[PDB]
């Protein structure tokens, strides 16, 4: 008491309610500004 | 595998959490534009 270990555990078992199941979350962050883009969609490159 | 039915079930039993219970949802769509009014509120017709 008064001395708490800062981080608590996400204990996960195959039996929880929807509010407690281990949701696998990933985030994708892009930088859509003016600079050579190394990442692009699968669109084909037509002629010029 | 790799051959999935597009559609699955709302398996409903009397005992789930509130997050899974069979809620009955009905939505009402209105078109509030200048056109002959066919559906109106219960307001009475007063004299002219």
Curated annotation (Swiss-Prot), chains A, B:
It comes from the Viruses. Residues 34-48 are annotated as: Disordered. Changing residue 5 to S: In strain: Lambda/C.37, Omicron/BQ.1.1, Omicron/XBB.1.5, Omicron/EG.5.1. Changing residue 8 to N: Reduced host ACE2-binding affinity in vitro. Attaches the virion to the cell membrane by interacting with host receptor, initiating the infection. The major receptor is host ACE2. When S2/S2' has been cleaved, binding to the receptor triggers direct fusion at the cell membrane. When S2/S2' has not been cleaved, binding to the receptor results in internalization of the virus by endocytosis using host TFRC and GRM2 and leading to fusion of the virion membrane with the host endosomal membrane. Alternatively, may use NRP1/NRP2 and integrin as entry receptors. Binds to host ACE2. RBD also interacts with the N-linked glycan on 'Asn-90' of ACE2. Cleavage of S generates a polybasic C-terminal sequence on S1 that binds to host Neuropilin-1 (NRP1) and Neuropilin-2 (NRP2) receptors. Interacts with host integrin alpha-5/beta-1 (ITGA5:ITGB1) and with ACE2 in complex with integrin alpha-5/beta-1 (ITGA5:ITGB1). May interact via cytoplasmic c-terminus with M protein. May interact (via N-terminus) with host bilirubin and biliverdin, thereby preventing antibody binding to the SARS-CoV-2 spike NTD via an allosteric mechanism. This is Spike protein S1. The lineage of its organism: Viruses, Riboviria, Orthornavirae, Pisuviricota, Pisoniviricetes. The gene is S.
